[PDB]
Amino acid sequence: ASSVHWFRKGLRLHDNPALLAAVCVRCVYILDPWFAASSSVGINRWRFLLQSLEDLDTSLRKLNSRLFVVRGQPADVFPRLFKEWGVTRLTFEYDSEPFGKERDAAIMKMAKEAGVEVVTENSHTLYDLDRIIELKPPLTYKRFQALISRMELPKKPAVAVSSQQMESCRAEIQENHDDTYGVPSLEELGFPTEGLGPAVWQGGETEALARLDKHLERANSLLASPTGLSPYLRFGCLSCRLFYYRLWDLYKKVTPPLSLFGQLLWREFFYTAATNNPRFDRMEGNPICIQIPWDRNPEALAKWAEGKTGFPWIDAIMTQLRQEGWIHHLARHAVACFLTRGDLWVSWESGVRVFDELLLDADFSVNAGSWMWLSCSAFFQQFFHCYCPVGFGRRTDPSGDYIRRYLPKLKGFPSRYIYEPWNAPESVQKAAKCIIGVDYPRPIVNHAETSRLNIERMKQIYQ
């Protein structure tokens, strides 16, 4: 048959169900390079996508095929491409997200009218999210535990695709193909590349599967680790089911507690809650979200996103996120708490956008979920689960080296004062050679006063 596998997501060949289903097969990614020119998402996540797409082309080229990166909007492209190659069927991995499902319903219909078969497999999640909802979406991590404990075990990693079977259905190779359907570049997509150094989080399934093996084998915690698999799970370079059962296999050599699958269940929990929540990213029109009257301060958001709040632990976290695309989960609770219920009283929706632009592992599902969790807007009620913009830093890194690596103007400050610089002697400031209100910004709020007011406003919302 003439089958098209849409690698819109799950940028992997290992544990790929729809790949085996479609197996003449042509692997397509559809990218609108003008949408990409006007994207608010920064260079780090766009680079990850391209590098991941480059890896599958490299992998497909090993199997005598190539990745067809078609340009344009998907609904306009598929019918002409259907007629161009006489596509017998189109196979794409199912998208839990509502906006994707609405787009996928239109393509599945357009194929139905056009007589093209459509097969969808949701290898992005460990389990069916729609199963759990019938069993209203689970609104607590515990009730969600309870429904997955009543649910069957998640599916095991999927089967491989043979090199001989792939050669049998290898697609037509043209010399012009590397230019026609070749993977785009950052400069093609509107990004300036001058001075761009080697990426901290290299994209692709090859890197991910390599990091899998390195991770299982084993303050710096806050720095990027070669073990880190957060972005590779978000794009699909690594399977949720492979990571689940390879972790299970290591535990058996070392019955599983929930603690190993915490990243995946927290991931799953938000994926379940969002499939049928259309405004999941928004406060209004959202059944699960508390209608908190969040203030609008455009200048606070700016100082928060631009790493200039005066609080070194906050500003160093935002600086790493801007520069590298990944911060530690405890660092995210820090900056989320500062922006929302802890200090600035700005909507979690504003934080969802900044993270979507800068963070490699942001989804519609995982991002809005975490932000509703911190803000105590949903799933969560412990409005005292509080983080000091000073104390949390000194407790995570007493050395202050994290600040020194990402805010080097404060490098000379001694550890006793590096998380709280306004409260430091001008003697030690001048020795550090960092001015109190020139070289670095001063605290834009006072945390003690502000935090007290915000709980009081928070408690009144519960009634």
Side-chain angles (χ1 to χ4, degrees), residues 292-294 340-343 345 386 447-448 450-451 453-455 458:
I292 300 190
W294 296 112
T340 61
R341 59 166 173 105
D343 292 82
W345 202 253
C386 59
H447 166 69
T450 313
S451 59
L453 272 73
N454 291 107
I455 310 167
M458 197 75 212

Side-chain angles (χ1 to χ4, degrees), residues 32 47 180 223 264 360 369:
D32 189 14
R47 189 186 199 179
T180 317
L223 307 167
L264 306 156
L360 296 151

